[PDB]
Design an enzyme around this catalytic site. Structure first.
Site, PDB file in Angstrom:
ATOM      1  N   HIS A  41     -37.955   5.997  24.775  1.00  0.00           N
ATOM      2  CA  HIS A  41     -37.437   6.977  25.720  1.00  0.00           C
ATOM      3  C   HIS A  41     -37.479   8.420  25.173  1.00  0.00           C
ATOM      4  O   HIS A  41     -37.111   9.331  25.903  1.00  0.00           O
ATOM      5  CB  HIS A  41     -36.063   6.604  26.286  1.00  0.00           C
ATOM      6  CG  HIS A  41     -34.913   6.818  25.358  1.00  0.00           C
ATOM      7  ND1 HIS A  41     -34.234   5.753  24.813  1.00  0.00           N
ATOM      8  CD2 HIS A  41     -34.320   7.968  24.959  1.00  0.00           C
ATOM      9  CE1 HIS A  41     -33.256   6.278  24.093  1.00  0.00           C
ATOM     10  NE2 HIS A  41     -33.275   7.609  24.140  1.00  0.00           N
ATOM     11  N   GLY A 143     -28.121  12.824  20.900  1.00  0.00           N
ATOM     12  CA  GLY A 143     -28.989  13.053  19.756  1.00  0.00           C
ATOM     13  C   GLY A 143     -28.967  11.941  18.721  1.00  0.00           C
ATOM     14  O   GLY A 143     -29.799  11.947  17.810  1.00  0.00           O
ATOM     15  N   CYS A 145     -29.621   8.729  19.257  1.00  0.00           N
ATOM     16  CA  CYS A 145     -30.621   7.719  19.548  1.00  0.00           C
ATOM     17  C   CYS A 145     -31.667   7.648  18.457  1.00  0.00           C
ATOM     18  O   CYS A 145     -32.026   8.674  17.881  1.00  0.00           O
ATOM     19  CB  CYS A 145     -31.235   7.935  20.925  1.00  0.00           C
ATOM     20  SG  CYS A 145     -30.104   7.538  22.282  1.00  0.00           S
TER      21      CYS A 145
HETATM   22  C1  LIG Z   1     -28.415   8.077  22.197  1.00  0.00           C
HETATM   23  C2  LIG Z   1     -28.649   9.487  22.692  1.00  0.00           C
HETATM   24  O1  LIG Z   1     -29.168  10.337  21.974  1.00  0.00           O
HETATM   25  N1  LIG Z   1     -28.248   9.706  23.984  1.00  0.00           N
HETATM   26  C3  LIG Z   1     -28.426  10.879  24.692  1.00  0.00           C
HETATM   27  N2  LIG Z   1     -27.982  10.952  25.916  1.00  0.00           N
HETATM   28  C4  LIG Z   1     -28.243  12.215  26.432  1.00  0.00           C
HETATM   29  C5  LIG Z   1     -27.924  12.671  27.722  1.00  0.00           C
HETATM   30  S1  LIG Z   1     -27.053  11.666  28.898  1.00  0.00           S
HETATM   31  O2  LIG Z   1     -27.639  10.360  28.863  1.00  0.00           O
HETATM   32  O3  LIG Z   1     -26.995  12.384  30.134  1.00  0.00           O
HETATM   33  N3  LIG Z   1     -25.537  11.514  28.369  1.00  0.00           N
HETATM   34  C6  LIG Z   1     -24.717  12.721  28.229  1.00  0.00           C
HETATM   35  C7  LIG Z   1     -23.275  12.399  27.917  1.00  0.00           C
HETATM   36  C8  LIG Z   1     -22.444  13.649  27.751  1.00  0.00           C
HETATM   37  C9  LIG Z   1     -22.350  14.280  26.516  1.00  0.00           C
HETATM   38  C10 LIG Z   1     -21.619  15.452  26.371  1.00  0.00           C
HETATM   39  C11 LIG Z   1     -20.968  16.002  27.458  1.00  0.00           C
HETATM   40  C12 LIG Z   1     -21.043  15.378  28.688  1.00  0.00           C
HETATM   41  C13 LIG Z   1     -21.777  14.209  28.833  1.00  0.00           C
HETATM   42  C14 LIG Z   1     -28.255  13.961  28.117  1.00  0.00           C
HETATM   43  C15 LIG Z   1     -28.888  14.821  27.229  1.00  0.00           C
HETATM   44  C16 LIG Z   1     -29.210  14.402  25.945  1.00  0.00           C
HETATM   45  C17 LIG Z   1     -28.893  13.102  25.564  1.00  0.00           C
HETATM   46  S2  LIG Z   1     -29.203  12.309  24.042  1.00  0.00           S
END
Ligand SMILES: *CC(=O)Nc1nc2c(S(=O)(=O)NCCc3ccccc3)cccc2s1
Ligand SMILES: *CC(=O)Nc1nc2c(S(=O)(=O)NCCc3ccccc3)cccc2s1
Lengths: 304, 304
Positions: A41, A143, A145
């Site tokens: 991903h 970040g 992941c």
């Molecule tokens: C494992 C990893 O790096 N996951 C990531 N998820 C995101 C997302 S998201 O899936 O939209 N989750 C965001 C959650 C959040 C964090 C802080 C404030 C509000 C909500 C979006 C962008 C980058 C990454 S990296």
């Protein structure tokens, strides 16, 4: 003496962490020999995650679109391929810090250490267990992941987990290093509910043995039970059924303490039925299930 | 998201661990630049520990009596000196793996990671806190002496603890890297009882903020309190008194969550008076006090 939730020393894994960027997405990669492993991903935008066609998305990517940085030096990507849910980026340089390693697919109830990383940089290390419902309860922010789970046997690192996602309930899902997810989870931003998070009975018993070895003995009682009688109680409290294999694995702990496995099962049975009554065991007010019998032996003997 | 008891990545410290032997005693040493630091009781036999005269014992030792081994290679000792309860062994080779480092003497309530070692080899890493009674609750078996505690700020390792002993109650005592013991403990096999192990109130509140940030909110109530009213309750439950400095340090957590510090104190007050009622907070059935406000901010923001 003393008994702690202990992670493996993370140095051998820290030397493998790299940063991988594809377009506007940055996550962690694992550099072993001349290959960098990372979640597929990395090729997705947040919009793509709703319903990605990874094969179609990967067609639009070339070797030069994968930016791999180890510390502050750039690695040259000379090949790329998708294996299940991981990308394998062949680079022109073998990681000089590559430790002796294996890729293992662990079973539920097994524990491992996680080196949480952000932008290829390690932030911390902690110990967790692969839950019976194939999730892990970790600490992963945006970040993280591509951060990996592993065990170490003397000089050999056995990589068992790569972080891919957080389910809407706050629990974590990921793959082995061949890219196969643990459990039924998919790398898609979709409704994925976890099954019952049952307690790892063999681990709780191992931890009760660790408690006796370290001086916490109040829970020892005058009772015994049978595997079938114990399992009736275990079913009622959403504990995993205890098998003769589990009894066999607790054998060295039973021998060290002189407490037969079924007598420890009767202590656990009473603890389930009556609770702790405001008391603690090894600094915990609940029954801990993230120490395997091997972890207890290892910690209680001093294996380095 | 997710919140875990996390240790610092231990790699920078793993590269400093050496084995030190003097006569028939083997423990761990810390090799930084051209100096190896280790507990002075390396010169003692188990009989000497009852009432050692370290100055007199050290007269009978020469540079060649201290055997320092880094991995499988021997370091040449060209000088030795005692500083408080540590020995400083000057070697002819600077450790090429020496990270950027500082020696700090921490205050009670501060947390740090421990790299447990045996015979100069790392076995595991865990997070603990310097208790208000100047003990630590670690996991140290025979041969773990000389294992160190540290914190890491980006590339700088701040060494704060060196393990020296286990009190008859199973708790651990040790020194800073200048050899000064934390608390009133001495490196002698004698009656040394620990004082009251009070709970680190500012840490519990920080962890309650971490719980709210990660979704566990059941304990939030409709009440508030004052510092003096809260402290009456804290005294009753052997919690450390909360000061305005503690309130100030919780400020960033109060701002992120929108829950004023004194309202969180009223939640803590109710939790102390009524208990958890069979419920958990961040996977714990007791109030956790080994996360400082800085640890909560660091983990909740992703500092590497
Ligand atoms: C494992 C990893 O790096 N996951 C990531 N998820 C995101 C997302 S998201 O899936 O939209 N989750 C965001 C959650 C959040 C964090 C802080 C404030 C509000 C909500 C979006 C962008 C980058 C990454 S990296
Ligand atoms: C920190 C460290 O290395 N401590 C050591 N203590 C000993 C001792 S002891 O002080 O007599 N404690 C022994 C405790 C014990 C362990 C296993 C079975 C029974 C009792 C003796 C020898 C070496 C070391 S190293």
């Amino acid at each position: 003496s003393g008994f702690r939730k202990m992670a493996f020393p993370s140095g051998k894994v820290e030397g493998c962490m790299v940063q991988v960027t594809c377009g506007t997405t940055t996550l962690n990669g694992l550099w072993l020999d001349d290959v960098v492993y990372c979640p597929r991903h990395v090729i997705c935008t947040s919009e793509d995650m709703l319903n990605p066609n990874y094969e179609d998305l990967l067609i639009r990517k070339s070797n030069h679109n994968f930016l791999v940085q180890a510390g502050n030096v750039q690695l040259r990507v000379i090949g790329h391929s998708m294996q299940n849910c991981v990308l394998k980026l062949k680079v022109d340089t073998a990681n000089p810090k590559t430790p002796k390693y294996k890729f293992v697919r662990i079973q539920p109830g097994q524990t491992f250490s996680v080196l949480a990383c952000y932008n290829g940089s390690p932030s911390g290390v902690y110990q967790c267990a692969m839950r019976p419902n194939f999730t892990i309860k970790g600490s992963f922010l945006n970040g993280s992941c591509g951060s990996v789970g592993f065990n170490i046997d003397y000089d050999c690192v056995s990589f068992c987990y790569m972080h891919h996602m957080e389910l809407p309930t706050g629990v974590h899902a990921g793959t082995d290093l061949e890219g196969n997810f643990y459990g039924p989870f998919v790398d898609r931003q979709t409704a994925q509910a976890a099954g019952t998070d049952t307690t790892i009975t063999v681990n709780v018993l191992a931890w009760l043995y660790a408690a006796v070895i370290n001086g916490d003995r109040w829970f020892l009682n005058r009772f015994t039970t049978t595997l079938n009688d114990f399992n009736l109680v275990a079913m009622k409290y959403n504990y995993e059924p205890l098998t003769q294999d589990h009894v066999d694995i607790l054998g060295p702990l039973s021998a060290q303490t002189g407490i037969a496995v079924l007598d420890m099962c009767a202590s656990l049975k009473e603890l389930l039925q009556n609770g702790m009554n405001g008391r603690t065991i090894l600094g915990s007010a609940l029954l801990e299930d993230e120490f395997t019998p091997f972890d207890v032996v290892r910690q209680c003997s001093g294996v380095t």
